[PDB]
Design a protein around this nucleic acid. Structure first.
Ligand SMILES: [K+]
Ligand SMILES: [K+]
Ligand SMILES: [K+]
Ligand SMILES: [K+]
Ligand SMILES: [K+]
Ligand SMILES: [K+]
Ligand SMILES: [K+]
Ligand SMILES: [K+]
Ligand SMILES: [K+]
Ligand SMILES: [K+]
Ligand SMILES: [K+]
Ligand SMILES: [Mg+2]
Ligand SMILES: [Mg+2]
Ligand SMILES: [Mg+2]
Ligand SMILES: [Mg+2]
Ligand SMILES: [Mg+2]
Ligand SMILES: [Mg+2]
Ligand SMILES: [Mg+2]
Ligand SMILES: [Mg+2]
Ligand SMILES: [Mg+2]
Ligand SMILES: [Mg+2]
Ligand SMILES: [Mg+2]
Ligand SMILES: [Mg+2]
Ligand SMILES: [Mg+2]
Ligand SMILES: [Mg+2]
Ligand SMILES: [Mg+2]
Ligand SMILES: [Mg+2]
Ligand SMILES: [Mg+2]
Ligand SMILES: [Mg+2]
Ligand SMILES: [Mg+2]
Ligand SMILES: [Mg+2]
Ligand SMILES: [Mg+2]
Ligand SMILES: [Mg+2]
Ligand SMILES: [Mg+2]
Ligand SMILES: [Mg+2]
Ligand SMILES: [Mg+2]
Ligand SMILES: [Mg+2]
Ligand SMILES: [Mg+2]
Ligand SMILES: [Mg+2]
Ligand SMILES: [Mg+2]
Ligand SMILES: [Mg+2]
Ligand SMILES: [Mg+2]
Ligand SMILES: [Mg+2]
Ligand SMILES: [Mg+2]
Ligand SMILES: [Mg+2]
Ligand SMILES: [Mg+2]
Ligand SMILES: [Mg+2]
Ligand SMILES: [Mg+2]
Ligand SMILES: [Mg+2]
Ligand SMILES: [Mg+2]
Ligand SMILES: [Mg+2]
Ligand SMILES: [Mg+2]
Ligand SMILES: [Mg+2]
Ligand SMILES: [Mg+2]
Ligand SMILES: [Mg+2]
Ligand SMILES: [Mg+2]
Ligand SMILES: [Mg+2]
Ligand SMILES: [Mg+2]
Ligand SMILES: [Mg+2]
Ligand SMILES: [Mg+2]
Ligand SMILES: [Mg+2]
Ligand SMILES: [Mg+2]
Ligand SMILES: [Mg+2]
Ligand SMILES: [Mg+2]
Ligand SMILES: [Mg+2]
Ligand SMILES: [Mg+2]
Ligand SMILES: [Mg+2]
Ligand SMILES: [Mg+2]
Ligand SMILES: [Mg+2]
Ligand SMILES: [Mg+2]
Ligand SMILES: [Mg+2]
Ligand SMILES: [Zn+2]
Lengths: 124, 99, 83, 104, 208, 138
RNA sequence: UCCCUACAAGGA
RNA sequence: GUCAA
RNA sequence: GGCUAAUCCCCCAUGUGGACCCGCCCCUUGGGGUGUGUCCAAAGGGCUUUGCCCGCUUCCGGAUGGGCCCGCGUCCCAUCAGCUAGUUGGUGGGGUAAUGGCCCACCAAGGCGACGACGGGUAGCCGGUCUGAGAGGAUGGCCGGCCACAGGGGCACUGAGACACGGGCCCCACUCCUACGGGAGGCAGCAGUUAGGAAUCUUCCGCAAUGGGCGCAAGCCUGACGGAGCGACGCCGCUUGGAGGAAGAAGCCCUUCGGGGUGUAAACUCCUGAACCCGGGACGAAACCCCCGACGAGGGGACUGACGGUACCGGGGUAAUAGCGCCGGCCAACUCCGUGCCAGCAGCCGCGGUAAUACGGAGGGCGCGAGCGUUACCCGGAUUCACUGGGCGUAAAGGGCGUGUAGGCGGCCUGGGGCGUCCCAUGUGAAAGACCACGGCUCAACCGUGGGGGAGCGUGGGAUACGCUCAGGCUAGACG
């Protein structure tokens, strides 16, 4: 565009949209479980993916993933959402943090333990 | 509770009253002067005018009306009086207006 | 009134004051009017005390009132000597 | 120093007061292009001396009223209705924008 | 802390002999002798053409692994070197070579660097007569690095300074073997050093 | 009407050189001439001279080129490789002396018009002055 | 669970 | 009927 | 209701002087001088007690602090386009320290807007900070400056100064006391409680130091401040060992069953010796004060340490924390088993349906290390809002066409002006920060001192090529 035009209209700074309305763009938001359903993956994939409908302290109600093999969550489990979507389930954009609240930390986990919240086992 | 420095409040009231008082006087004499000055009562109006002058500067001695505030008052008065008098009769008592 | 006093500029357990001219009412480490010296109370340097002896004079000349500690340092730098 | 600005009188419809239009040109902060903005100042004219179309000097002054902070220093030249015209026309255009517009 | 673990396993990964133990890395066994290939279950398999990245990384690793410094400390020195005037490559090298724990080694007061480290940490060393227990202390030109008076009798210091009898020392360093004291004369020139490292690749590794 | 007689000239010259013409005319103006003077001095062109195409003043600009060359496309090198208009009507560009640019580490030049007259970046610099940065050339 | 091919479906 | 190869 | 002191209040005098009216002079907005008239001063106290100290009054000035005004700059929406009655200006008043619709009476009918008025949304602003090659983007915690607020709203009193966070009055909400009439209260001070939340600490020590208030001083007050406490929250330093040691233990992992790996790693020999125990043990603190001198200059003397029996010095002295992420490509690091579109991984591309370097485990490896990862947010890469630095025939993008308003842009020659533009000098650009140098804590982080910068704006002087403007001229553009 002409300078004159740029003078008249100028360029336009465009702002990006949050992929995580876990409000107050906090790093984590606490909630309670509505449903502890199970879901099927998208196209290329196939399996029974674990999920949860969560009522947030942020006055929000969203579905969150349950990383890990183990899992002990029920219709009233207080849990901590951490944001991070599952590319396979459209509509799932937050993971649940295993190791906080009513979310037991994956058992017999010996590798990526810090994720999945699994305390160190005594080597012996 | 109980901060004895509420003594400042008692004083303010006494002071307030003491101030309020001097001012009322000032006004009443000032009005009185512009009144008589406006009626050609030269000698009488100047007489009172001087009181007002005096009372004003005195007010300015302390916190009451201290300042250029005094000056303003005096000015504005010696203004109205001399004008109202010029609108008719000669300055008899030579009050405070100068030659 | 305006003063000549010490402003704290060192660090924890490492004080270093700036002999300063400032309004009595300002906070101590606040915006001063002029720096006219500095003092290392622990003489960790052969230069733990310096004073713009002329400048000090100037302010004293116009009402600057020094803290007792400030006055002390000023004297030491010979701000009051006459001979 | 009290600011001295030069402008053209666009209004004398006020007792002892004339509106002085004042322009200034300058580099655009990011695009360079010398752009030219303007502003109207209500200046004091106690003698009603200055007229419409006069180019005058305006000088920073002690407030004469809320909105009036300049006095007319002097006449630089006069009779430039051309400048007045522009302003008037530009103003005409206005009421020809919103749902209240009019002429072509 | 420092590395603290199998050291000759690094000589092996970098394919080039490093003197982490100093001595023994001279014997018919710095391992760089028997199995001069990478550690681990695949250390003998066919190497694969390393990536431009792989290459620089490995090269930086080598250099820093020599002085046994932490990546954090390492990186901070490098940054200091960049900001500084003169060729980052060389200057950076001068700085590494100025670490006291290093100098101590260069003067032979100790056989390896790791050993020369412990010698500083344990107060056995002195700069200008004042005890200094900071491996990272930066030795400047003029500074004389001596052995702590009170420790000039340790069996270890004996042998070490003994072996230094008739032994040569870097041009930037002087060494009076009897008085168990040395002197940092000047910062070494890239030329003075003979490191199995192309510092240039490093500067690159960090410019990424 | 030409919107910008300088860009026009700069261009006639750019165009003419690409088809290796010998000379090339350009409607004359003193300012325009002043520029050629530099072009000539700097040896980008053989030189110029006034003339009258139809009793109207123009300026023949005699262009220079390199020598014929080797393999395919024996066309000579251009003496004037680059020649770009900088300040333009609708976006004038002015520079202070400390901001006169350095065209190709010196291998090139910049023509600014200053109150001390039209000069090359070095000249302007030497004479301690800035002005309108007219165009660069190399 | 099996038949089908890894499934869907269909079949015992 | 769908995923892949 | 009664008594009473004063540095409390008032009257009279004195008038250096100052205030006000009118005149005149200089100066130019209300600055300075002068004359007449008028008006205006005061507080006493202490002694080493008859002459010094603290203080009082009027005035001129200094210094510091501050009020008010002006040019320029300061986010998003035009799915906000018209806004305005104290509104704009005037005269005369009121008000103030002071200008002003600041407020009022009356007259005039104005003022503002596309250069974005009005409306809506959001927000304390700055020095700076983060990022970036830069231009720029983002940001404003800590520290320093300015503003604003002190449960919400309004108001004034006192005073040099407040419309006053720990002053006052009223209205509202809330809590509490209540003998039901009526009262008390405001932590966005320190510390702490509770609520909310993913989340943010001691109801600590001291007044020793710096600073503040009052006092002649002694000294008192000071949750300002100087310290300690808690939290890997951050930055920096440091330790978990050093040298020797097999063609190489055992176990574990692989295997072409020959062997390869973990690996000098361990064991073990020798050495030093973090922690811990003894001893010594601080700078920060020399003033105020006192004596000499003269309550001065100068000299002499005494008192005072929270931190703390801490730092640091010396003696003795144990071989004694390692974890976390990752290993399909991008990206450093590979094998076995388990599993069988399942359980699951996943930043993007993608991986798992019987031999998966991608799932889970193990061995091995890479990276970093008192940390390592994760999530969120900011700049980068992104020349992916392009000023530097992009585009629109078919990729997203030429308005369906025209007329023409504002606006942007403007051929050739001469002259004036000097607005843009360029140059010189000068003021400004606080400190901290940033950069360089030297220096103090053993280093560093941290800190001290010194040096170099700087755009923007103000002022004076200068230049005139280009742009602008004024004046004259031309004919190549345009029109006839
Ligand atoms: K004064
Ligand atoms: K001022
Ligand atoms: K900002
Ligand atoms: K900024
Ligand atoms: K010791
Ligand atoms: K050990
Ligand atoms: K694997
Ligand atoms: K980004
Ligand atoms: K279209
Ligand atoms: K249309
Ligand atoms: K001219
Ligand atoms: Mg732009
Ligand atoms: Mg799949
Ligand atoms: Mg009292
Ligand atoms: Mg009355
Ligand atoms: Mg008029
Ligand atoms: Mg007015
Ligand atoms: Mg460098
Ligand atoms: Mg061109
Ligand atoms: Mg070109
Ligand atoms: Mg079908
Ligand atoms: Mg499939
Ligand atoms: Mg009574
Ligand atoms: Mg009194
Ligand atoms: Mg007299
Ligand atoms: Mg009297
Ligand atoms: Mg008025
Ligand atoms: Mg007034
Ligand atoms: Mg108003
Ligand atoms: Mg405007
Ligand atoms: Mg608005
Ligand atoms: Mg807000
Ligand atoms: Mg960029
Ligand atoms: Mg409020
Ligand atoms: Mg309030
Ligand atoms: Mg509150
Ligand atoms: Mg309230
Ligand atoms: Mg008052
Ligand atoms: Mg209040
Ligand atoms: Mg309070
Ligand atoms: Mg809670
Ligand atoms: Mg704290
Ligand atoms: Mg104290
Ligand atoms: Mg004190
Ligand atoms: Mg108290
Ligand atoms: Mg504190
Ligand atoms: Mg924390
Ligand atoms: Mg060992
Ligand atoms: Mg004391
Ligand atoms: Mg790889
Ligand atoms: Mg399964
Ligand atoms: Mg994984
Ligand atoms: Mg650390
Ligand atoms: Mg960009
Ligand atoms: Mg984008
Ligand atoms: Mg562009
Ligand atoms: Mg594009
Ligand atoms: Mg298409
Ligand atoms: Mg298209
Ligand atoms: Mg078209
Ligand atoms: Mg037009
Ligand atoms: Mg032109
Ligand atoms: Mg024009
Ligand atoms: Mg001209
Ligand atoms: Mg000019
Ligand atoms: Mg400047
Ligand atoms: Mg300076
Ligand atoms: Mg500064
Ligand atoms: Mg040092
Ligand atoms: Mg500095
Ligand atoms: Mg100038
Ligand atoms: Zn080795």
């Amino acid at each position: 565009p002409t300078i004159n035009q740029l003078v008249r209209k100028g360029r336009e700074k465009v702002r990006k949209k949050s992929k995580v309305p876990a409000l107050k763009g906090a790093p984590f938001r606490r909630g309670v479980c509505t449903v502890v359903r199970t879901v099927t993956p998208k196209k290329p994939n196939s399996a029974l993916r674990k999920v949860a409908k969560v009522r947030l302290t942020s006055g929000y109600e969203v579905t969150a993933y349950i990383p890990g093999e183990g899992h002990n969550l029920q219709e009233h489990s207080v849990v901590l959402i951490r944001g991070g979507r599952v590319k396979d389930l459209p509509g799932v954009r937050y993971h649940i943090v295993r190791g906080v609240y009513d979310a037991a930390g994956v058992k017999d986990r010996k590798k990526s333990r810090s994720k999945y919240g699994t305390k160190k086992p005594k080597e012996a | 509770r109980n901060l004895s420095a509420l003594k400042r409040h008692r004083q303010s009231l006494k002071r307030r009253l003491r101030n309020k008082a001097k001012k009322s006087a000032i006004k009443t004499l000032s009005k009185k002067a512009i009144q008589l000055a406006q009626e050609g009562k030269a000698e009488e109006a100047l007489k009172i005018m001087r009181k007002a002058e005096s009372l004003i500067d005195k007010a300015a001695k302390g916190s009451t009306l201290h300042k250029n505030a005094a000056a303003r008052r005096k000015s504005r008065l010696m203004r109205k009086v001399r004008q109202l008098l010029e609108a008719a009769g000669a300055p008899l008592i030579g009050g405070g207006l100068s030659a | 009134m305006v003063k000549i006093r010490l402003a704290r500029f060192g660090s924890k357990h490492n004080p270093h004051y700036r002999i300063v001219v400032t309004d009595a009412r300002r906070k101590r480490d606040g915006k001063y009017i002029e720096k006219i010296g500095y003092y290392d109370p622990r003489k960790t340097t052969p230069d733990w005390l310096k004073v713009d002896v002329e400048r000090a004079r100037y302010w004293l000349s116009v009402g600057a009132q020094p803290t007792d500690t400030a006055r002390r340092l000023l004297r030491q730098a010979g701000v009051f000597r006459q001979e | 120093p009290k600011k001295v600005l030069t402008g053209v009188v666009v209004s004398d419809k006020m007792q002892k007061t004339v509106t002085v239009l004042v322009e200034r040109q300058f580099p655009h902060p990011l695009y360079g292009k010398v752009i030219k903005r303007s502003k109207k100042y209500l200046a004091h004219d106690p003698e009603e001396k200055y007229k419409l179309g006069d180019v005058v000097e305006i000088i920073e002054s002690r407030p004469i009223s809320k909105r009036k902070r300049f006095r007319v220093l002097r006449l630089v030249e006069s009779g430039r209705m051309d400048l007045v015209e522009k302003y008037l026309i530009r103003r005409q255009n206005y009421e020809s924008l919103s749902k209240r517009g009019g002429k072509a | 802390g420092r590395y603290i673990g199998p050291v000759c396993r690094l000589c092996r990964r970098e394919g080039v002999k490093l003197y982490l133990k100093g001595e023994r890395c001279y014997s018919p066994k710095c391992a760089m002798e028997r199995r001069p290939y990478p550690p681990g279950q695949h250390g003998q398999k066919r190497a694969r053409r390393p990536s431009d990245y792989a290459v620089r990384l490995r090269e930086k690793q080598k250099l820093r692994r020599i002085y046994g410094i932490s990546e954090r400390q390492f990186r901070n020195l490098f940054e200091e070197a960049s900001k500084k005037k003169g060729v980052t490559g060389s200057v950076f090298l001068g700085l590494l070579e100025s670490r006291l724990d290093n100098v101590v080694y260069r003067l032979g007061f100790a056989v390896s660097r790791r050993q020369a480290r412990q010698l500083v940490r344990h107060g056995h060393i002195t700069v200008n007569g004042r005890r200094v227990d900071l491996p990272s202390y930066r030795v400047r030109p003029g500074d004389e690095i001596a052995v702590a008076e009170k420790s000039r009798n340790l069996e270890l210091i004996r042998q070490n300074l003994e072996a230094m009898k008739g032994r040569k020392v870097g041009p930037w360093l002087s060494l009076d073997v009897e008085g168990m004291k040395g002197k940092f004369l000047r910062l070494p020139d890239r030329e003075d050093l003979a490191l199995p490292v192309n510092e240039q690749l490093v500067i690159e590794f960090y410019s990424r | 009407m030409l919107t910008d007689p300088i860009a026009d000239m700069l261009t006639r010259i750019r165009n003419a050189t690409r088809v290796y013409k010998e000379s090339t005319d350009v409607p004359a103006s003193r300012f325009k001439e002043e520029i050629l003077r530099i072009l000539a001095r700097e040896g980008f062109i053989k030189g110029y001279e006034r003339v009258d195409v139809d009793g109207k003043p123009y300026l023949r600009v005699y262009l220079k080129y390199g020598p014929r060359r080797q393999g395919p496309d024996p066309r000579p090198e251009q003496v004037i490789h680059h020649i770009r208009r900088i300040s333009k009507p609708g976006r004038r560009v002015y520079v202070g002396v400390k901001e006169i640019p350095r065209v190709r580490r010196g291998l090139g030049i910049a023509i600014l018009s200053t109150s001390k007259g039209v000069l090359t970046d070095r000249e302007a610099r030497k004479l301690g002055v800035g002005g309108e940065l007219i165009c660069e050339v190399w």
